[PDB]
Design a protein around this ligand. Structure first.
Ligand SMILES: Nc1nc2c(ncn2[C@@H]2O[C@H](COP(=O)(O)OP(=O)(O)O)[C@@H](O)[C@H]2O)c(=O)[nH]1
Ligand SMILES: Nc1nc2c(ncn2[C@@H]2O[C@H](COP(=O)(O)OP(=O)(O)O)[C@@H](O)[C@H]2O)c(=O)[nH]1
Ligand SMILES: Nc1nc2c(ncn2[C@@H]2O[C@H](COP(=O)(O)OP(=O)(O)O)[C@@H](O)[C@H]2O)c(=O)[nH]1
Ligand SMILES: Nc1nc2c(ncn2[C@@H]2O[C@H](COP(=O)(O)OP(=O)(O)O)[C@@H](O)[C@H]2O)c(=O)[nH]1
Lengths: 241, 299, 297, 234
């Protein structure tokens, strides 16, 4: 089988659980870290998948130093692997959900991505893209990228295989679990009195891009960069110190 | 009552008052409170159908290090009625890492306006007509989480329902299906009951001798919080131009009741309860502030 | 100043205000000042077209040994509008052998209403709506002598105009021919200018910008003092049932502009300047009373 | 010829001068005396008219009737020392048409002066009142005169006595109405006639004062008011 660890970080009510169900087509569903193990048997290859949710993130009045729990979790996994050297449970991917506000990064997001960008691969997703018009989505993406480049945050750059799809970072995702009948078509989407927002539509949200890149096109490069960059650096101080 | 044997002319009296108003203009002070990026400026521009917000939605916004309270003043004319409108917004509310004392500048602003009015009132050399800077309406924006209210929202609403009229609205209601909106409204109302957050219109402030007003305001409260959508862009749907938002799957209509609830909010603010808001501000909130401060300034 | 782009609905505000007055009603206070037998009760009954005066004009009257102040209150219904009307008469005024300091009770009454309003306003446990008992109008009755104002009349008007809105009227004007009426009005106006008596309306209490309302008040000022006739008995003249007095030589009609100036007085009080009288009372006379007391205390 | 004197008392602005000119068809409180020679109907009348100016005009009218009394006493003293009839024979008091009753000044004057000069009460400006109002005012005035025990001058021989107190209208202007020349007052609603019995009581007063019952006034002055002063003096 194959092993993978995906962490979900974001404020509550941003479609985190719905997106996780949508990607993996399964009923998978004080800031600590909650672990859920699933065994997904699809496309022949069986994946033993781990989801590390961080519930309570950003739900408090004072959010100072609320990112220490995820740092502790990543470093604990690092130490467990280092001891076992003498199963890869290291957190390979981290999906960060940014609220669809339309102005830029909040200070909390900046702090999380400034103190976690040299621990885990950060994939920023704009949560709930079905509440923005395309122009707003592009403006928000540009502002987020400008602020990321201003604060010197090193995100995860996807490798060569979709050229216009991998340049869509940060991804704007829409998740749904209900199957609707549009003209005899079974489609996953959300039904509003004004129309049906479809999850798999390429013009509506970047769900298909993320599903392809993460689930079945680049799930091994994440592990490789985790082993050769983040874990190597972590050993480069603890052994040195 | 003493019966009349002819026509006297008291019925003209209303017109006389009307004429006086034409030379002064009515003062209205709105304050929008909520996290940045919830549509406060857009909703202010949608309610008054003019570019009356301090910052237009296009311009860049940066979160300040501290919670500031900014005000803008305008004059709006319609059919001879002038409205001196002061819109006050809260840049930096609920956006910092540490949101403690985020409601302090808001209450400081309201109390400082009350203080200005009372100092102008007590002075020997008093003006004929005291300018009114008191905040008459406060619109609180609830992010469309779909689960429950945030802790900061509960705290600020509890602090604010005591010194100013507060009207809750679900910001960006376009992101919730009808079932989700219904469930969210039920949760919000149960939470408001549980924390005893009594929002406008408070039926305790309405007379018992009047029943039609009581039933109407009961319906308005039963509708709260309002699922609102704000937009200053019009789009052609069918064969009519409607204010709304355009996404790949359709257009959300601001003026359609079957799409949102902007109609109810704007009717209450402008068309049905504006003078009631002013009267409650000048007869329930300012009166209690004046009583409390003078009971300390007895000497 | 800020252009709009649609129907916001601000224009509804006036209607809203109406619905909030409809339940509470308005309140007016008139004070009639003059000697006995000058038609004060009949004039108050004629203005409001109801038996509103304290004393019905046909009952009895005995001159009191002192100048007394008496007040009656009524609620008047007019097409949904409630008027809380206070009528204050001054029996015994100007009728004694010695009339020295006969203006003291009137000034005392007005200052008492100002005291009540001020003491309720300064009070820490203040009511939401202070009932206004202040004297909003003061109709001053001048007897139809045809020569000049009496000295007792000049004194009282001079004292009253500084604290109250005073509207001079010529009582029982049906006893004056038109030529006599014009000479009497001219002499009264000249004496008012000579002794510096400023009667309502006063143009110093009006905005400089406004002119279309300044001119109207100037016309009303030039027409003062009004020549009034009051009655409550309906007589059949031709084919019309008209209010008036039936003498032995004709029917004097109250509502006829060719006969008496009652219409001008009733339009000024009830239909055109009611709220202006209330506003000038609240903002010019009440404020000057307030500034004097607070400096004293 | 025939000597007589009439003293006019009342407030300023009540048609006293006009009424004097109508009755005899000729054009501090200190009594002012004027002398006229009227050769009416062939009989020469030397009429001394004593007006009281300032009566009821000042703010303080306390004892303003003393000048009137001092005038009558001085004439009485002059006649007694001589013993020319300069004694004040008639006095006309004008009551303002208030419609209620007698004022305190009227009561005080008629109390102090009704034992020193003949007093004929007149309701000045009788056109102010409808006939019902005038009748009610007359009834109340007579009731109050009887309550104060005021004694007025009753008329001998010559229905007309029941009209006391006389409601008089005075006018010096002759006008043309209905093809006739009448003395009266012109109003938009009609003309109030001086010489109409149904409008006022001027004709009765003229008949009593001038035509018929004037030597009676002289007799009641000499035999009642002059005797009492001399009796007190003696
Ligand atoms: N507008 C929008 N709403 C969503 C989306 N996905 C889920 N939701 C709704 O958001 C609400 C809360 O999100 P939930 O799925 O419970 O995930 P959470 O973020 O773990 O709370 C639910 O009502 C969802 O149905 C989305 O893509 N767009
Ligand atoms: N989905 C949705 N978006 C909105 C709405 N109103 C405004 N926006 C968008 O949200 C972004 C921020 O709105 P703005 O009014 O600037 O937010 P503020 O900072 O809270 O005043 C803008 O790009 C708007 O176009 C709304 O009702 N629904
Ligand atoms: N000439 C004249 N008489 C009047 C007028 N109004 C009333 N009267 C009469 O005056 C008498 C008493 O008037 P009244 O109303 O009692 O005056 P008051 O005593 O000062 O209140 C009544 O008999 C009325 O008929 C008027 O306008 N002109
Ligand atoms: N209504 C009325 N007015 C009169 C009458 N007589 C005179 N007048 C007017 O009243 C005014 C005063 O008259 P006057 O004789 O000068 O009064 P005096 O000062 O008492 O002598 C004059 O303008 C007269 O025209 C009358 O009988 N009825």
């Amino acid at each position: 089988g194959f092993e993978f660890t995906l962490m979900v970080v974001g404020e509550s009510g941003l479609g985190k659980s719905t997106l996780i169900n949508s990607l993996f087509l399964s009923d998978l569903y004080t800031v600590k870290v909650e672990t859920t193990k699933v065994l997904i048997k699809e496309n022949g290859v069986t994946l033993r998948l781990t989801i590390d949710d961080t519930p309570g993130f950003g739900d408090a009045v004072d959010n100072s130093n609320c990112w220490q729990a995820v740092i502790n979790h990543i470093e604990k996994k690092f130490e467990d692997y280092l001891n076992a050297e003498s199963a890869d449970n290291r957190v390979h991917c981290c999906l960060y959900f940014i609220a669809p506000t339309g102005h830029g990064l909040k200070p909390l997001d900046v702090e999380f991505m400034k103190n976690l960008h040299d621990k885990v691969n950060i994939i920023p997703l704009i949560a709930k893209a079905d509440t923005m018009t395309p122009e707003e989505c592009l403006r928000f993406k540009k502002q987020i990228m400008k602020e990321i480049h201003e604060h010197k945050i090193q995100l995860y750059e996807f490798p060569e295989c979709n050229r216009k799809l991998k340049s869509r970072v940060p991804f704007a995702v829409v998740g749904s679990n209900t199957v609707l009948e549009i003209g005899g078509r079974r489609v996953r989407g959300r039904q509003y009195p004004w129309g049906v927002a479809e999850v798999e539509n390429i013009d509506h949200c970047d769900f298909t891009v993320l599903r392809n890149m993460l689930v079945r096109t680049h799930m091994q490069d994440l592990k490789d960069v985790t082993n050769n960059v983040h874990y190597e650096n972590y050993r480069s101080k603890k052994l040195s110190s | 009552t003493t019966p009349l044997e002819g026509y006297v002319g008291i019925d003209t009296l209303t017109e006389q008052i009307r004429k006086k108003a034409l030379r002064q203009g009515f003062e209205f002070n709105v304050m929008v409170v909520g996290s940045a990026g919830l549509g406060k400026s857009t909703l202010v521009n949608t309610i008054f159908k003019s570019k009356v917000s301090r910052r237009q939605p296009e311009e860049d916004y940066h979160t300040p290090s501290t919670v500031e309270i900014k005000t803008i003043s305008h004059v709006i004319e319609e059919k001879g009625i002038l409205l001196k409108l002061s819109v006050t917004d809260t840049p930096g509310f609920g956006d910092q890492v540490d949101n403690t004392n985020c409601w302090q500048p808001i209450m400081r602003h309201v109390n400082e306006q009350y203080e200005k009015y009372l100092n102008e009132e007590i002075s020997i050399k008093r003006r004929k007509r005291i300018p009114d800077t008191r905040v008459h309406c406060c619109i609180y924006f609830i992010p469309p989480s779909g689960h429950s209210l945030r802790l900061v929202d509960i705290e600020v609403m509890k602090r604010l329902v005591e010194i100013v009229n507060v009207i809750p609205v679900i910001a960006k209601s376009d992101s919730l299906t009808l079932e989700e909106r219904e469930r969210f409204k039920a949760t919000i109302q149960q939470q408001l009951i549980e924390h005893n957050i009594r929002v406008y219109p408070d039926l305790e402030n309405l007379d018992v001798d009047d029943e039609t007003e009581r039933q109407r305001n009961l319906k308005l409260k039963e509708r709260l919080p309002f699922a609102i959508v704000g937009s200053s862009t019009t789009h052609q749907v069918g064969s009519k131009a409607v204010l709304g938002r355009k996404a790949g799957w359709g257009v959300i209509e601001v003026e359609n009741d079957a799409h949102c609830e902007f109609n109810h909010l704007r009717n209450m603010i402008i068309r049905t309860n504006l003078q009631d808001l002013k009267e409650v501000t000048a007869q329930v909130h300012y009166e209690l502030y004046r009583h409390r401060r003078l009971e300390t300034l007895k000497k």
